[PDB]
A paper describes a structure:
In a wide variety of bacterial restriction–modification systems, a regulatory ‘controller’ protein (or C-protein) is required for effective transcription of its own gene and for transcription of the endonuclease gene found on the same operon. We have recently turned our attention to a new class of controller proteins (exemplified by C.Csp231I) that have quite novel features, including a much larger DNA-binding site with an 18 bp (∼60 Å) spacer between the two palindromic DNA-binding sequences and a very different recognition sequence from the canonical GACT/AGTC. The overall structure of the complex consists of a C-protein dimer bound to a DNA duplex. In the complex, each subunit interacts with the DNA by inserting recognition helix 3 (residues 28–40) of the classical helix–turn–helix motif into the major groove of the DNA either side of the central GAAAA motif.
The best diffracting crystals were obtained using 21 bp duplexes corresponding to the core sequences of the OL and OR operator DNA. The C.Csp231I–21-mer DNA duplex complexes crystallized in three crystal forms. For the OL complexes (space groups P61 and C2), the resolutions obtained were 2.30 and 2.75 Å, respectively, while the OR (P61) crystal form diffracted to a resolution of 1.80 Å. The DNA duplex in both complexes is significantly distorted from canonical B-form DNA, with a bend of 39 and 43° for the complexes with OL and OR, respectively, similar to the value (41°) observed in complexes of C.Esp231I with the OL operator. The bend is stabilized by amino-acid contacts to the DNA backbone: principally electrostatic interactions with the phosphate groups on either side of the recognition site. A comparison between the OL and OR structures reveals minor conformational differences, and these are principally in the flexible C-terminal region (residues 86–95); the latter are unlikely to be significant given the flexibility of this region of the protein. There are no base-specific contacts with A9/T13 in OR (or the equivalent G9/C13 in OL), which is the only site within the 15 bp core sequence that differs between the two binding sites. The same is true for the A2/T20 (C2/G20 in OL) and C19/G3 (T19/A3 in OL) base pairs that lie outside the recognition site. This is consistent with the DNA-binding affinity at theses two sites being effectively identical. EMSA analysis of C-protein binding to the left and right operators showed no differences in affinity between the two sites (data not shown).
Residue numbers in the entry:
A (entry chain A): 1 to 94
B (entry chain B): 1 to 95
The structure:
DNA sequence: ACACTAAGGAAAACTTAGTAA
DNA sequence: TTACTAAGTTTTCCTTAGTGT
């Protein structure tokens, strides 16, 4: 998991490390420590946990695993598109 | 990491589990077991390893962590596009 | 409040060994 | 060959407890 992506999206959601952990299912007495290790690169959440985090952060989970800033923005933008716009991007390269 | 993405990409690259592991720097005696566990969901590789797999598999790594099939397809296509065509999509992905 | 950290106990991965398909 | 697993160690994470910012 990329810590730049966690941080950025968390800031954009405008919440603390701890409240992110709490909203994602981590006990209040571990949330702050755990989310900080995640965000400072000390440990990695498992994939289940990153899914909960992403839901909480309102992003597609794969955004947290995308090193390419351009592809990352495409994923981000694709997240707010409707099936109309999403399909028209589908055949857009086809 | 999503086991189906790993499997589908490994089969599209046309190599076996063991060979993929060896090309990712896993000792040849650990590779078969280790890649099999990854692809059956017994165990999950770390992101550093996932990056090495993607490189072998000639894919963007985040493909392996995309549950949405339509986003995953978008990722693969973007993958194959050259630098110039990336501008075109980028321009459209804006505002 | 919020961010951050070492240290231990707990959990999950890696290596080994070997069996089918 | 290629796919796959149980076991025990290694490695990593999760919890605690608490400092700094």
């Amino acid at each position: 998991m990329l810590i730049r992506r966690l941080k950025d999206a968390r800031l954009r959601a405008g919440i603390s490390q701890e409240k992110l952990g709490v909203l994602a299912g981590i006990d209040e007495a571990s949330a702050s420590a755990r989310m900080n290790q995640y965000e400072k690169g000390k440990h990695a959440p498992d994939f289940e946990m990153a899914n909960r985090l992403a839901k909480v952060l309102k992003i597609p989970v794969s955004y947290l695993y995308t090193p390419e800033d351009d592809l990352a923005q495409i994923i981000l933008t694709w997240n707010e598109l409707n099936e109309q716009e999403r399909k028209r991007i589908n055949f857009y390269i086809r």
